[PDB]
């Protein structure tokens, strides 16, 4: 839910995450697939130095 993320997370990062989710959705990614993709991406960013 958007409310849960909005209250749980600061508005900038929540907007970034929801934007990535919408980008996935517009390319045919399912809600489960896009949620899993966001989870894997945040794990990779925190572990792998993608910068």
């Amino acid at each position: 839910m958007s409310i849960l993320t909005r209250w749980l997370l600061i508005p900038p990062v929540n907007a970034r995450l929801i934007g990535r989710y919408r980008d996935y959705r517009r390319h045919g990614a399912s809600a489960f697939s896009a949620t899993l993709g966001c989870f894997w991406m945040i794990l990779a960013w925190i572990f792998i130095p993608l910068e």
Partner: protein, 144 residues
């Protein structure tokens, strides 16, 4: 006018509260949920005027100092106000030694670590919700 737009979070007073939480985990502070939550709500009152918010901070600074002094096991401010003449008349070296003995450097290090942790988390997750949730859970436990 609007009131919900001013709920920006406890901000620095949140870390100030985290200090008391740390003292509670170590048992060095006897927590009082009533006064703590009352001050938290006072800080959480949405003031449309920015001058009102700044005045609230200015008034709360000595109020916060007195609250922190009272919540501890130290004697009340009346005793120190009465004994200030003797405290000033005491030798400086003995006062410094007493301060150092009272100063727990482990607490200082823990405070710095938690300060850095909260500063980092203040960019990813809302600490206000977690702090108010912990306060509510502590109040419920005290009620139980």
């Amino acid at each position: 006018s609007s009131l919900w737009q001013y709920w920006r979070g406890l901000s620095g007073w949140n870390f100030y509260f985290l200090v008391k939480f740390g003292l509670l985990w170590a048992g060095y502070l006897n927590f009082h949920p009533l006064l703590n939550l009352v001050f938290a709500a006072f800080l959480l009152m949405p003031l449309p005027r920015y001058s009102l918010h700044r005045l609230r901070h200015w008034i709360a600074l000595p109020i916060g100092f007195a609250l922190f002094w009272h919540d501890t096991w130290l004697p009340g401010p009346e005793s120190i106000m009465s004994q200030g003449s003797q405290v000033a008349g005491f030798s400086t070296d003995y006062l410094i030694d007493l301060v150092t003995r009272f100063i727990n450097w482990q607490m200082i290090g823990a405070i710095f670590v938690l300060l850095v942790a909260w500063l980092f988390l203040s960019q990813w997750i809302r600490i206000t919700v977690f702090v108010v949730a912990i306060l509510l859970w502590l109040n419920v436990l005290t009620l139980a």
